[model samples]
Target: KVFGRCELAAAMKRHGLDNYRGYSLGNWVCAAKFESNFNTQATNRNTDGSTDYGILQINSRWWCNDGRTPGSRNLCNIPCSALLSSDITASVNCAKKIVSDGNGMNAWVAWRNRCKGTDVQAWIRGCRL
Candidate 1:
C-alpha cells in the first residue's frame, strides 16, 4: 500500500513510532519518503546482495530474513515478505526494535541524509495527532 503523507503519519503514531527513540514522527515520515516513498512493496538490493523491504525498507541483512541473505540476523524474527504486505504493523514493530538496539533512525541512511537536523514540520503540516 502506498500512503499519503498524513496517512502514514497516522499509521506510525498508531504503532508507537512517535518519538519512539527521540526521533520525531516527522523524522520517520521523512525517512519513508526518501527511503520507499511510503510504498509497502518497495524492495532494494544492497551492495552486499542483501535486500531492503517494505515501507520503512527494513533490511534483510540485519532485520528480517529473506532466505537469500544468509548473513541475516532476523532479529525481527519475521520473513521479509511480511514487510511487503499492506499491513505495516510487522515492519513498524521491527523498526522499534531497531531503535531499541541503539541504531535509532540512523539505521536508515535515508534518515541520516534527509531527516536529521532538518525542520520536518512539512512532513506533518496540518496533520493533527
Candidate 2:
C-alpha cells in the first residue's frame, strides 16, 4: 500500500519510530518516501544477490532471511516474506533492531542521501506527532 506523508507518519509513530534512535518522525517519513515511496510491498534486488524488502526495504544480507541470499545472517530473525506484507510490524521491528544495534538512521542509504542534510521537519509539517 502506498501511504502519503501524514499517513505514514502516523503509522511510523504507532510503531515507536519517533526518536527511536534519536531521529525525529520526519526523518523516518523522509527516508520512507525515498527508500520505498511509502509502499508497504516495495521490493528491490541488489546486484550482490540480496533482496531488499518492504516499507523500509530491509536488506536480506544481514537482516531478513529469505533462504535465497547466500549470506543470510537473519539478524532480525524474520523471514523476508514478512517484510513485504501490509502489516509492517516485522519491517518496523527490523528497522528498530538495526538502530538498536547502533546503526542509527544512516543504515538506510536513502536517509543519508536524501534526508541527511535536508529540512526534514517539512516532511511532517502540520502533522501533529
Candidate 3:
C-alpha cells in the first residue's frame, strides 16, 4: 500500500495524539510496531474466512458504524466492507476518545493480544484509570 506523509500528519493532528508521544504516537507506534510495524496500510485475512482492514488495522465489521454505507466511497468516507477510511485521521481520533473513556482501550488490548501477543489482563497493569 502507498502511504502518504501528509495524510499521516493529518491523522496525527486530528487525533490529539501528539503531545504524549508515549501513549499516543509512542504507544501507537509501539503497538503498530508490534503488530504492523508502522505500516498504516496493512491487512490480514483471518483464518476464520473474514477480512480485516486498514491502518490501525480495524476489522471492517467493527468499524461499520457512524453512517457508513456499503459500496459508497469517499476519501473521508469508506464503504463498511472496506478496510480504512480516506479520512483515516478520523479513525485515530475516534480511537483516542474510546481509550480516554476507558471503555475502548480494551479493544486495543484485545488487538494487542490477537495481533501483538499480549494478554489483556497482563497488558493493562499499572495504567491510570
Candidate with more favorable, higher lDDT: 1 or 3: 1
Candidate 2 per-residue lDDT over residues 106-129, each given as its tens digit = 888889988998999999999866
lDDT values of the candidates?
0.88, 0.87, 0.47
Q: Which candidate's TM-score is highest?
A: 1
Give the Cα-based TM-score of candidate 1 against the true structure.
0.95
> Residues 29-129, candidate 1, lDDT per residue (tens digit)?
99889989889999999899999999988888888887898756888999999999988899899988887887667878888888888998779999877
RMSD, candidate 1, Å: 1.1
Lowest lDDT 10-mer window, candidate 1? 99-108
List residue ranges in candidate 3 displaced over 4 A: 1-14, 19-22, 65-87, 97-104, 109-129
Put down candidate 3 lDDT per residue, 33-93, tens digits, no spaces: 4454445556666554444455665544344332433442233244433445455555565
lDDT rank order: 1, 2, 3
Q: What is the lDDT of candidate 1?
A: 0.88
Residue pairs in candidate 1 whose N, alpha carbon or C atoms collide under 3 angstroms: none
